[PDB]
Amino acid sequence: LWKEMQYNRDITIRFKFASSIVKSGGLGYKW
Amino acid sequence: QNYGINLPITGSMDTAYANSTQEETFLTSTLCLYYPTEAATEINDNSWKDTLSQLFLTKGWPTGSVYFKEYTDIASFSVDPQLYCDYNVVLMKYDATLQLDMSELADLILNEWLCNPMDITLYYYQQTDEANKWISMGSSCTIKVCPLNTQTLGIGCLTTDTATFEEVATAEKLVITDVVDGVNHKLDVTTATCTIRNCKKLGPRENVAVIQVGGSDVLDITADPTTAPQTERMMRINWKKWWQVFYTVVDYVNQIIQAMSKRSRSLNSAAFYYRI
Amino acid sequence: NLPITGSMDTAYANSTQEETFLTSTLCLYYPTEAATEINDNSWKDTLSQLFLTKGWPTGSVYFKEYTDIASFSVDPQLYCDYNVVLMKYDATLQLDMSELADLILNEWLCNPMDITLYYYQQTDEANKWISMGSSCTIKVCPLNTQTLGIGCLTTDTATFEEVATAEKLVITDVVDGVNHKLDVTTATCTIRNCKKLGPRENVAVIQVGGSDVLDITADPTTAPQTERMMRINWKKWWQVFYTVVDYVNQIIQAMSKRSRSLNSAAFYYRI
Amino acid sequence: NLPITGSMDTAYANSTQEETFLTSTLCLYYPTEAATEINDNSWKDTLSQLFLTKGWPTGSVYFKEYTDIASFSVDPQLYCDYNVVLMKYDATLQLDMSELADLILNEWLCNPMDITLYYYQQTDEANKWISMGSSCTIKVCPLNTQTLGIGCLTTDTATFEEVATAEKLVITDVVDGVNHKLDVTTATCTIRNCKKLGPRENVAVIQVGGSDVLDITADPTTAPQTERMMRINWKKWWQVFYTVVDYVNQIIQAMSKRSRSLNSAAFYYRI
Amino acid sequence: QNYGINLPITGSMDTAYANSTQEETFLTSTLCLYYPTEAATEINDNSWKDTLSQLFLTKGWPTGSVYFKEYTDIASFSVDPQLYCDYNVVLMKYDATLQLDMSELADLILNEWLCNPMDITLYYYQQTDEANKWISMGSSCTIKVCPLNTQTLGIGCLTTDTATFEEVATAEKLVITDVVDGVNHKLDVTTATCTIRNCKKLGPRENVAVIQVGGSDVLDITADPTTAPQTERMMRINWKKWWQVFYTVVDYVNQIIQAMSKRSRSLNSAAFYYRI
């Protein structure tokens, strides 16, 4: 059969974003 | 038998008693005497086993029924003790420093146990009933227990750091651990040196009598603090020399075995039934 | 205290153990060496949580510590509704163990004694002289009907008969009906004339290791070993405390509420 | 709790005042300035003997001292069967003293408030947040269904609304049915979600000087003075204690036994 | 509940309600597979036990119910075999040079044996009836036997000279000795590296099956020459690869269990007969 076991945990999600910066041709005035 | 186990047995209160069966019981049974090594050392004789056999024969045992098993001491004998004969008599020398161990040994050999393997590395373990214990035996058993909570987190102990676990046994040849029931425990044991099993006490053994040589009434074969029953199978005698002890055992074998009963010797010689 | 008439067929009520645990409290007394061997700073908290698993609400169990039997014997105060004292057995302290058990397992009605002013005698077998303090040294001089010492001199206290020396608790039992002059070091110990009313049913004593040596009755012919005097074998204190927690149901079953009306307002716990 | 059918023709029983004085304990709480002004090391014994003249057995009256109202408000433990708190009036502390009264003149069922992870709200008028400690600085940020704050940012405590600063005790009442984010100094404070069940009948408060300013109910439309809120003008503390001793029967008359079955952990001074 | 007595059980030959649930075996009972080490060597997979557990679980056995045990060879396994699961299957490889040994092994595990100690130094021994044998186990059992006469003198041997003893076992890991019944014998055994026990064959061991992986039918679990029974628990399969053997075992595990029954000596019904 099956047993129920509990897990309450105090978590700290530490995350962040990343950025994709792709620039267009020319002299660099356009992204 | 099994299909008629749950059937009544009716007996009239006037059926005539049958003639004595002790003679036939001796003629059809075998007796095992378990004694320390110091007993044989003090006796300092090689033919003493043969003389004891002859004296037992004088007491009504066929030549071949009495066997003598020698064990070093209480601690070493506590590692997987084996009960071979129909009737087992264990002469435990009393040492005031090993009271618990003595009790433990008695608790193991005066009672039937039903045991299961314990993979302490993979499961938490509960003790469901007062009859449930953890019997561990080996060369040296050190048991450390962390009681968890309803959230599978150690109480007073870090579930990952064994150093914070609670010491309930250190370098034990045998130990019967009893923890709070209904609590999941994380166990760490010296598995290389000892084996731990989840055991259930089924009842008395009735074919193992423990004679305590010297001391006082210190045995406690029940983990319940408010009971220290003294059954007929746990006897106590005073001694100054071992030959007198053995003569007392021989001369009162009738009384010793009248307190014991056949029908209880298991097919295996082990001190517990095992279910893997 | 009125007569109680009952029928032999009244239905049994449900178990009161759950509500008893919810409405009472348990004081557990242990020696300092127990805490020393445990070597944990939160063992009280984990024991309380285990008791809660067993039924007792948090904060209901109180853990009190005493250095040893002798120190605990100096006027021991028992607070909770149910008291369990884990007394470690020492082969050389049998009489002190017995005296402590007699003091805490029985109810005593005590009055002060003025040894320096009046002679004192013991009326009956229930009457004793309990002296406790830092150091009790009691010497006794029995007197004949002419208020003159027997085997002792009233003026000279050296001739007195020594019944206690440097004891932290001693129950003195002398021949009843005889007047005695008492020399007691009152500066460091107080002696009281006490009568045994009956058993204290809210105090159990668990003797850790040893044999049944307790004698809570001065009669040579009786060694009761009541149901409130348990004994266990041990090697580690954690196992002892686990056994106490697991079988607390049986331990409380062996005990009953105090059931004595006290004229002294002392410090207790009562949830 | 069962129905209690009684007859209006029953005869009045004799005065139980002597019996309750004999079988109960009285606790007197006074400020340290009382003992300072009295300036006598034996004043406890003098009051005990006066109470004995009033009927209370020696030892049943217990005298407890508190530095001041602010200090006493940190988990006030009331021990005896009957508690009388002599509270000096200070026009600057009208709320604080009131809060103290609200804490000790009523029964509170409290549970922990783990603010740092949970969002809390008050369900009804009986619900309050009792915070106690060395320094309770509580800031509140009301929220809405979208979890955003009203005039506050949950991520910037500086915008939280200030409801208490450096408080030894504070009873916080916010709008019911609204979730709030709480920021209180947990190091020097503990906040509990509490429900007032009813009056605490074994605790009376005697305000020494001033005027009737206590408001033990958060509702602005009610400022009731129960019989357990006395107010006496004073110039000497000896006179205060004499009037407390002389009218002890009247004070206890205004009080009743606690009658509540608790679950908390507090020692008591009972006989 | 009534454990010490054999009470008759009555049933109706026309009784209805012939329900069944083999699933009860799977979830409640445990399966043990005993195989030689060379099987694992040939398989040469580090997770084959997991795959076999998965395949068994296809047949209804919950994970953890099936256990796998390794033994080096027939001779090593024969040293005091310990089969503890509810259902035991032993994949015994056939070796034409080790017929008797295999038979002995099967005779030890396919039957139920009630064994008592033997003190060859003290006592002479007989074999009372056809079911009485002398089972010796150890690293190297070498048993020599000298039959006596009614005057206690040896027949074709000298009791005081072991060189004349009639050797019946030489360097055996396990050997079951059957001698003439009703004749006292002096036994010389290598007690240091071998223990000999006086055993009685109670009956079949229901919960142990032996699958012979290889040659023809050669097992003789009966000492009687006139009978060589082939019970349903003695299976035989032809093989070339061990994965095939294990797949056949798993696919037909239901039939293998059907050929077996719960150990009649291992349930509460048999309490106080011999064991549990």
Ligand SMILES: *[C@@H]1O[C@H](CO)[C@@H](O)[C@H](O)[C@H]1NC(C)=O
């Ligand atoms: C039983 O004992 C009696 C008296 O000792 C004896 O006469 C009898 O033969 C014995 N056997 C039976 C079957 O009664």
Ligand SMILES: *[C@@H]1O[C@H](CO)[C@@H](O)[C@H](O)[C@H]1NC(C)=O
């Ligand atoms: C009550 O008081 C009355 C009058 O003082 C007295 O007669 C009586 O004995 C007292 N006790 C009871 C139980 O009525």
Ligand SMILES: [Ca+2]
């Ligand atoms: Ca041990």
Ligand SMILES: [Ca+2]
């Ligand atoms: Ca710890």
Ligand SMILES: [Ca+2]
């Ligand atoms: Ca347990």
Ligand SMILES: [Ca+2]
């Ligand atoms: Ca016990």
Ligand SMILES: [Ca+2]
């Ligand atoms: Ca003493």
Ligand SMILES: [Ca+2]
């Ligand atoms: Ca003298």
Ligand SMILES: [Ca+2]
């Ligand atoms: Ca006396």
Ligand SMILES: [Ca+2]
């Ligand atoms: Ca006595």
Ligand SMILES: [Ca+2]
């Ligand atoms: Ca305030």
Ligand SMILES: [Ca+2]
């Ligand atoms: Ca704001």
Ligand SMILES: [Ca+2]
């Ligand atoms: Ca509100």
Ligand SMILES: [Ca+2]
């Ligand atoms: Ca108001």
Ligand SMILES: [Ca+2]
């Ligand atoms: Ca020969």
Ligand SMILES: [Ca+2]
């Ligand atoms: Ca062989």
